[PDB]
Amino acid sequence: AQTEQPPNQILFLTNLPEETNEMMLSMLFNQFPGFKEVRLVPNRHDIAFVEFTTELQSNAAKEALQGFKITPTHAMKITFAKK
Numbered sequence: 001a002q003t004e005q006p007p008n009q010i011l012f013l014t015n016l017p018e019e020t021n022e023m024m025l026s027m028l029f030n031q032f033p034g035f036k037e038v039r040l041v042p043n044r045h046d047i048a049f050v051e052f053t054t055e056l057q058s059n060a061a062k063e064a065l066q067g068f069k070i071t072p073t074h075a076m077k078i079t080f081a082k083k
Contacts, residue, residue: 002079007055010081011062013048017074020045024070032061046074049081 002014013025025038029050034057039049052058058080068076 002077003082005080005082007059008080008082009052009055009058010083011050011052011058012079012081013050014046014077014079015075016046016048017071018044018046020048020070020074025050028065028068028070029061032057032064034058034061050078 002012017024020040022038022040025040025048026035029035029038029052032052034053036051036053038051041047050061052061062078062080065076066078070076
């Protein structure tokens with residue numbers, strides 16, 4: 001289940017395509033100069049995690065891609081993950 005926090009350098013993502021892949025989210029988020037990596041769930045794909053350098057750049061990427069259609073019916077939900 002999703003949660004929220006003050007800004008954190010790791011994000012949890014939901015409402016993704018049932019076919020999302022590491023390459024897709026890397027291609028999307030690596031545009032921001034704070035990206036590090038992603039972790040799909042290669043048995044669901046409709047949720048993922050994304051990892052960044054700094055909490056502020058993570059927040060900027062969240063603001064930028066919340067509601068982003070990865071595909072026409074899969075508006076990327078984004079939430080702060082925890083560590």
